[PDB]
Amino acid sequence: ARGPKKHLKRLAAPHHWLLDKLSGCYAPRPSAGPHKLRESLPLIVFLRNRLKYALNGREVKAILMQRHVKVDGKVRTDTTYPAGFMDVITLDATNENFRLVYDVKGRFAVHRITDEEASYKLGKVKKVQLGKKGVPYVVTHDGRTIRYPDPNIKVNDTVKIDLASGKITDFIKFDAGKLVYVTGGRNLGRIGTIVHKERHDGGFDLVHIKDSLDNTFVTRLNNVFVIGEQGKPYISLPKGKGIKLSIAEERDRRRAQQ
Amino acid sequence: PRAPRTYSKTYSTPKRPYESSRLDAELKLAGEFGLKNKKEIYRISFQLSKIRRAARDLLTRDEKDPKRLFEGNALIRRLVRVGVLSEDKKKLDYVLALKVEDFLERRLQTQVYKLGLAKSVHHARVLITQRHIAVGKQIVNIPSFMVRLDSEKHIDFAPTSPFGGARPGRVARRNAARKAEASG
RNA sequence: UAUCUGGUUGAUCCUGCCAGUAGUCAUAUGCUUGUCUCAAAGAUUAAGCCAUGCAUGUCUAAGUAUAAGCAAUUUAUACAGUGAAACUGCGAAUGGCUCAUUAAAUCAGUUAUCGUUUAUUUGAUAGUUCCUUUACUACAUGGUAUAACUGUGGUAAUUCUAGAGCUAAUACAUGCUUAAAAUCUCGACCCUUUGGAAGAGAUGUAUUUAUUAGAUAAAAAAUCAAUGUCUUCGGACUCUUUGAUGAUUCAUAAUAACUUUUCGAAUCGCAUGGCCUUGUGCUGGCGAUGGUUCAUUCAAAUUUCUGCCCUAUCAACUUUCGAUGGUAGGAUAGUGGCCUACCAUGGUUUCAACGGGUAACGGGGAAUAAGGGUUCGAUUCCGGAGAGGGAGCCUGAGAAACGGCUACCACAUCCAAGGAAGGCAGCAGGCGCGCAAAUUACCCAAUCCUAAUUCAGGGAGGUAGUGACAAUAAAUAACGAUACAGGGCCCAUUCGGGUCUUGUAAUUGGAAUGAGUACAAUGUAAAUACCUUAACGAGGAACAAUUGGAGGGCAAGUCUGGUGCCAGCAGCCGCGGUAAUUCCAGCUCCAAUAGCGUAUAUUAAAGUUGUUGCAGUUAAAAAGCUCGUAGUUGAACUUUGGGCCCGGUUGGCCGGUCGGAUUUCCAACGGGGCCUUUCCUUCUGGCUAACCUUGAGCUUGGCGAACCAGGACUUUUACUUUGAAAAAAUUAGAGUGUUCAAAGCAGGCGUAUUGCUCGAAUAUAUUAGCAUGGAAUAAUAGAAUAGGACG
RNA sequence: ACCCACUCGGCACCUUACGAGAAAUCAAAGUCUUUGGGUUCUGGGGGGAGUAUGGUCGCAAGGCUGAAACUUAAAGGAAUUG
RNA sequence: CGCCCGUCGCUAGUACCGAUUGAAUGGCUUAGUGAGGCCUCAGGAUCUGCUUAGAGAAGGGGGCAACUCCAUCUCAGAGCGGAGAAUUUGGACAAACUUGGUCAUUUAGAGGAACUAAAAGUCGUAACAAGGUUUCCGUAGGUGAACCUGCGGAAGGAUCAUU
RNA sequence: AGAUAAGGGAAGUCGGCAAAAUAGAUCCGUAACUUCGGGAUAAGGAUUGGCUCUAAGGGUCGGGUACGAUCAACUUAGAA
Ligand SMILES: [Mg+2]
Ligand SMILES: [Mg+2]
Ligand SMILES: [Mg+2]
Ligand SMILES: [Mg+2]
Ligand SMILES: [Mg+2]
């Protein structure tokens, strides 16, 4: 009402943050940034609740204000900066590098990566257009604008970003036999090797997707992120690599390693 | 505007207040197990009703169902873990065939009585309440504890208690003071 | 945990209700109350009124400081440390409270903006601006105020202000400084026809209008209008640029201009470096702030479909002057009768319109439930609406804002009567109203939010106090020895001991313990509690458990005394009239127990609302009879059977592993393909695929979906399967020593010296909408004066 | 016109109870807890009361629609023995 | 010697009709008047820049003698403007008030007419047996009251019955 | 005989006698009751001038085997 909201109560936050329902009435509202606040992770909850490197927002602020943490090469000393999918986070102290990817339960994992892998990121192009004076440009999933792309780069493709400059090194197209990451919905976190896509001109192009264990499913085209061709991926996959074990085999593995 | 604390009721009163069969049956149970109300029996029958309802709505589904397999194995495991259900009986119908005395046989009160440190369930009750017990190496003063079939090897007296040493006791120290006065 | 019982009768079986019975995150109230955890709390009546005090302000290295402020720099003579005030910039449109209004309205799920605004982030993004643009000009940077401050005053008073004197900006209001090339216009002049020119001007972005491009399934030829790039002027002729969407007049670009003319940095902090033609010469980093446009993000505004309680003792409603629509224009950020002008007569309704009522904010949800269901939802989350009732509006990206103004109305405050100031449905608190709801406490330590921002602020929030609203756990005693009374067994020797016993005692003992104090420590922003713990702290007259009842229903008195149809009891039947199992007491006993009763409302009981699942001859109820529209329902019939294969699940000895697993197997179970008259859409293309393709036993060459793109068409549904989506919390439920448990989402494991590691699942979530398989069941259409199909 | 046999459609009747029902009784009042052929109307303890009021029809008498307050633990059905 | 109906009379309670063009409260609304701010037509207090501009006097530079040129105190006067308060025209939004109208909910009322109880009141005895005239329905009329009578109907009859 | 009167407004009088007020037209709105025909101009409100315009409402002639020309009305509505 009357303007934008600036608070976010607990029990209204997205559940994949794993914020406890006790310990405060409010949740850290992500500031405006490159991602939607639903599919984002504030640096406060990432540093405190996933890494345990801090206990308070005061300690997170004390870490941020001395320019220790940087994300996508930029320092970003904001407590509620929305870190989203495949954003890289570099901590020069501890020489740590994380890449924000979903685990198969649908939450963000602490996926430690090396420096040569932290030197880039992939972006799913959302629209290709002609800017002013006829300059073509793309818009990635994190709102990055990249001018003068390759003319073969159409929508729903993946571009590899230099992450020091904003240039494109190469790009992956979108058709059958491509390794994808599911980012959104019930199947959020699986990796499943497109077999074919159905059009349905008028809304919500569907795509059929089968994992390494031949368990197929289907997803809207909004939630799919192609990350290479079948076999080799262009990034380091987290543990499990998006299989979505059933609860039976999950407790069998928990009884195996114990 | 904080998240409300969840709470639940743990028992249920019976429909008919006064019937002699239920009355003297539960009074026999209370006398044999050393309880202070019918509320404990009501709580145990409530837990048994929930368990039986889960078994019923699992049995309505056929076998080879993942939900039936998963939660039936989980429930059977939890019952054989607490020791209310024997190891041979793991077929989800003996779970329905259980009764409240099987649950009352696993309380710490009757377990202390069976281990023989009490000589009576009321002695076990006052011992547990007076902290002269340790189910592992930790004092527990709740008689309705539901030992987990591995703790009977560790049910014994507390180290920081009489019958475990390290201090005689309050009225013992008093009597030592009075007999030192008579010594003077 | 799918349960019934008492009451109509002289007795019976029924119908039928009354009463009982259990529960309530449903309240109130009575009596009583020891402990631990957790915790609602002026909603209901009055969205009634409010004393007082707080709840929104804010700075860095980085906008402005001569505080006549504090310091000491001693590096400083412009400043440069800190820093009140004030200007400036942001914020105050969030949060919090309440549920008055509101019944297709809100709201839920589901769409859309190819119909719009968007501060803030985040990512990109202005060489074009000196205007006769050769003095018009500061571009090592241009102007004017003004606050704070000094000083003079006013009034009874207010977060009231006047006059005078300074002074600043990222305040206002002006204003320049950077290429080149290319293309267009005009065009001097040479003058030729093939005609060429010197020179001048314009050409960023933003606004407005007009116009153009923004394309394309295929192949060649005939000549002209003039040759068109270059010629061997035969004409070889190509190159020709065109992105996206299902779809656009889209994105974008280009011409003609239009604008009272936007923007295109006169801003700030650190580091002070390189080149020399050594001048305060030229270059030069890391940031901050700002800035036009696009995109993104936070949103907002409209918007598609379907869904809302009770009423017909509301059946017709809407349209004067907006009702439904059309055209055009205004207005809006935009669509649109949103408004105006003209024009038409439309639009809704028994499939419940319109009107009325709601002791109606909607939903997530809550209680009770064998199933189905019934009732509630002011209230911890989401979405609305409101700030005493209306209306209007400034500022700003965002308000019809109220801890912002203006007016009226109603209440109401202070006056030295002139005038001034008001909005607790924010936090406490106070009057009222009531059957009914707490402290005018402490703190920003957590959770978060705002600011110029690590630092300040925050009655948001947290902590404690009141608190028998509800929930969780759980004391009020245990064990002996003596004295009686048993039941077997040794003796079977009279009735003698009795071992081992299960209870009773004007029998008696030592132990154990917490409630409660309390040194301490822990706890916490600081405390109080909790968990620990010195010392103290049970023997009964103590450290003493209540509430209701004892005819039945319905557990437990034919015990005693009093009363005598009186007093009274009794949810219902009933008790009481001088022998009361029912009143008042005592004794005893019973039910639940720190809780129990009472009232009211609701659920089950209630198959006494009946879809599941009632009854209608006589207990209540077939309309007097027939017709008949809406509604509901509606005969049968159209590919069946037979085969042949392929491969999945359950089995089955083999167990060929030591109660785990495999294969050749008899069978069942569900799938797919092919054939039996059985098209079960095909055109352009490509992969040509499985390929007659066979090179000697792994080689050179078949038919497009099995991989696509576009296509032409394409009977429509209902139903059902699967899947996407359906916020979290709640519900069910997996795991897990909160010490158990309600809970919570934690935790667990090591050589604990350096660390390692599992989690925080899953399911349900109607209806509507979306995609998908099936194609029985129920509808629908087709070729019959053939203006039918194939071709 | 009768008689016999049969058949369709009627008004009914007699006997039994497989069945139903509280019973009286019922070839429908059966095929209804083993609860679903299609469909219309009506009832929710007894009074107050088919009353009051408001509509609408009728010349009128009246008809159709149609409450509430209040009150009550029984009214009532079928059979049994007196 | 059971049960049982109604009038009338007393007492208490509930609701209804009711003259009073009753009353009060609340909502909506016609018409009239109409604050406020907003948009517009003006308006111009005041403040302020520029172009000048002339007179009268001071100073300075120059034929050095009158005289000539440039500056300073004075005050008219003219324009070119810019900002701009009060006030004001018209418009739309429109609070609020007045007077009516209408709807809804309570609320007074002489009197009238019901119902319910209570109470062994008065008068009869209508129904239950063939209830002593068989009961009951519809309709009409009448009578102190239950009720009676007429027409038609019913068996819930006192008849399942005369080949 | 005709009129006008401040403030009040039937206190005057047997009695509002007399006088005053109202009045036409257009638009809106119109109750009880009813013999359903009425009541009804119910009650009760608004508007009305001049000037300059706009709109609508007609006749007669004209077409091989949609329209044009011409002439003339007072009726209503609206706007400055
Ligand atoms: Mg935030
Ligand atoms: Mg009876
Ligand atoms: Mg009796
Ligand atoms: Mg009841
Ligand atoms: Mg309310």
Ligand SMILES: [Mg+2]
């Ligand atoms: Mg809010």
Ligand SMILES: [Mg+2]
């Ligand atoms: Mg930016």
Ligand SMILES: [Mg+2]
């Ligand atoms: Mg329009």
Ligand SMILES: [Mg+2]
């Ligand atoms: Mg229109």
Ligand SMILES: [Mg+2]
């Ligand atoms: Mg309400």
Ligand SMILES: [Mg+2]
């Ligand atoms: Mg809310």
Ligand SMILES: [Mg+2]
């Ligand atoms: Mg508001």
Ligand SMILES: [Mg+2]
């Ligand atoms: Mg108020």
Ligand SMILES: [Mg+2]
């Ligand atoms: Mg307001």
Ligand SMILES: [Mg+2]
């Ligand atoms: Mg306030």
Ligand SMILES: [Mg+2]
């Ligand atoms: Mg308050």
Ligand SMILES: [Mg+2]
């Ligand atoms: Mg007692």
Ligand SMILES: [Mg+2]
């Ligand atoms: Mg009593």
Ligand SMILES: [Mg+2]
């Ligand atoms: Mg009894």
Ligand SMILES: [Mg+2]
């Ligand atoms: Mg009694």
Ligand SMILES: [Mg+2]
């Ligand atoms: Mg007694």
